[PDB]
Coordinates of all heavy atoms in Angstrom, one line a residue:
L43 N -20.0 6.2 8.0 CA -19.1 5.0 8.1 C -17.8 5.2 8.9 O -17.3 4.3 9.6 CB -18.8 4.4 6.8 CG -20.0 3.8 6.0 CD1 -19.6 3.4 4.6 CD2 -20.6 2.7 6.7
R45 N -14.2 8.3 9.2 CA -13.5 9.5 8.8 C -12.1 9.2 8.3 O -11.6 8.1 8.7 CB -13.4 10.5 10.0 CG -14.4 10.4 11.1 CD -14.5 11.5 12.0
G46 N -11.5 10.0 7.5 CA -10.1 9.9 7.0 C -9.4 11.2 7.2 O -10.0 12.2 7.7
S49 N -11.3 13.3 4.5 CA -12.7 13.0 4.1 C -13.5 12.5 5.3 O -12.9 12.1 6.3 CB -12.6 12.0 3.0 OG -12.3 10.7 3.5
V51 N -16.9 9.7 5.5 CA -17.3 8.5 4.6 C -18.7 8.1 5.0 O -18.9 7.9 6.2 CB -16.2 7.4 4.6 CG1 -16.6 6.3 3.7 CG2 -14.9 7.9 4.3
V64 N -20.6 3.8 -1.6 CA -19.9 4.6 -0.6 C -19.5 5.9 -1.1 O -18.9 6.0 -2.2 CB -18.6 3.7 -0.1 CG1 -17.7 4.5 0.8 CG2 -19.1 2.4 0.5
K66 N -17.3 9.3 -0.3 CA -16.1 9.9 0.4 C -16.3 11.5 0.1 O -16.0 11.9 -1.0 CB -14.8 9.4 -0.2 CG -13.5 10.0 0.2 CD -12.3 9.5 -0.6 CE -11.0 9.4 0.2 NZ -10.0 8.8 -0.6
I93 N -10.5 -1.0 -6.4 CA -11.9 -0.4 -6.2 C -12.3 0.4 -7.4 O -11.5 1.1 -8.0 CB -11.9 0.5 -4.9 CG1 -13.3 0.8 -4.4 CG2 -11.0 1.8 -5.1 CD1 -14.0 -0.3 -3.7
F108 N -17.9 5.4 -4.6 CA -17.3 4.1 -4.9 C -18.3 3.0 -4.8 O -19.4 3.0 -4.2 CB -16.2 3.9 -3.9 CG -15.0 4.8 -4.0 CD1 -15.0 6.0 -3.3 CD2 -13.9 4.5 -4.8 CE1 -13.9 6.9 -3.4 CE2 -12.9 5.4 -4.9 CZ -12.9 6.6 -4.2
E109 N -17.9 1.9 -5.5 CA -18.4 0.5 -5.3 C -18.4 0.3 -3.7 O -17.4 0.5 -3.1 CB -17.5 -0.5 -6.1 CG -17.1 -1.8 -5.4 CD -16.1 -2.6 -6.1 OE1 -15.1 -2.0 -6.7 OE2 -16.1 -3.8 -6.1
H110 N -19.5 -0.4 -3.2 CA -19.6 -0.8 -1.8 C -19.0 -2.2 -1.7 O -19.4 -3.1 -2.4 CB -21.1 -0.9 -1.4 CG -21.3 -1.2 0.1 ND1 -21.3 -2.5 0.5 CD2 -21.4 -0.4 1.2 CE1 -21.5 -2.5 1.8 NE2 -21.5 -1.3 2.3
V111 N -18.1 -2.4 -0.7 CA -17.6 -3.7 -0.4 C -18.1 -4.0 1.0 O -17.9 -3.2 1.9 CB -16.1 -3.8 -0.4 CG1 -15.6 -5.2 0.1 CG2 -15.5 -3.5 -1.8
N112 N -18.8 -5.2 1.2 CA -19.3 -5.6 2.5 C -18.2 -6.1 3.4 O -18.1 -7.3 3.5 CB -20.5 -6.6 2.4 CG -21.1 -6.9 3.7 OD1 -21.7 -8.0 3.8 ND2 -20.9 -6.1 4.7
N113 N -17.4 -5.2 3.9 CA -16.1 -5.5 4.7 C -16.3 -6.2 6.1 O -17.4 -5.7 6.7 CB -15.3 -4.2 4.9 CG -13.9 -4.4 5.4 OD1 -13.2 -5.2 4.9 ND2 -13.6 -3.6 6.5
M158 N -10.2 -3.8 1.6 CA -11.6 -4.2 2.0 C -11.7 -5.7 1.7 O -11.4 -6.1 0.6 CB -12.6 -3.4 1.2 CG -12.6 -1.9 1.6 SD -13.4 -1.7 3.2 CE -12.1 -0.8 4.1
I169 N -8.2 -0.1 -1.8 CA -9.0 1.2 -1.7 C -8.0 2.3 -1.3 O -6.8 2.1 -1.1 CB -10.2 1.2 -0.8 CG1 -9.8 1.2 0.7 CG2 -11.1 -0.1 -1.1 CD1 -10.9 1.7 1.6
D170 N -8.6 3.5 -1.4 CA -8.0 4.8 -0.9 C -6.7 5.1 -1.6 O -5.6 5.0 -1.1 CB -7.8 4.7 0.6 CG -7.8 6.1 1.2 OD1 -7.5 7.1 0.5 OD2 -8.1 6.2 2.5
Ligands
LIG401 C1 -13.8 5.6 0.3 C2 -13.1 6.4 1.3 C3 -11.7 5.9 1.4 O1 -10.9 6.0 0.4 N1 -11.2 5.5 2.6 C4 -12.0 5.2 3.7 C5 -13.0 4.2 3.6 C6 -13.8 3.8 4.8 N2 -14.7 2.8 4.8 C7 -15.1 1.9 3.8 C8 -16.0 0.9 4.1 C9 -16.6 0.1 3.2 N3 -17.4 -1.0 3.4 C10 -17.8 -1.3 4.8 C11 -19.0 -0.7 5.3 C12 -19.0 -2.1 4.9 N4 -16.2 0.4 1.9 N5 -16.6 -0.3 0.8 C13 -15.9 0.3 -0.2 C14 -15.1 1.3 0.2 C15 -14.2 2.2 -0.6 N6 -13.5 2.8 -1.2 C16 -15.3 1.4 1.6 N7 -14.7 2.2 2.5 C17 -13.5 4.5 6.0 C18 -12.5 5.5 6.0 C19 -11.8 5.8 5.0 C20 -10.7 6.9 5.1

Side-chain angles (χ1 to χ4, degrees), residues 43 46 49 51 64 66 93 108-113 158 169-170:
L43 292 178
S49 75
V51 181
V64 171
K66 173 194 213 172
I93 196 74
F108 293 92
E109 138 190 37
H110 184 274
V111 175
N112 182 203
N113 190 48
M158 292 287 126
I169 74 155
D170 205 340

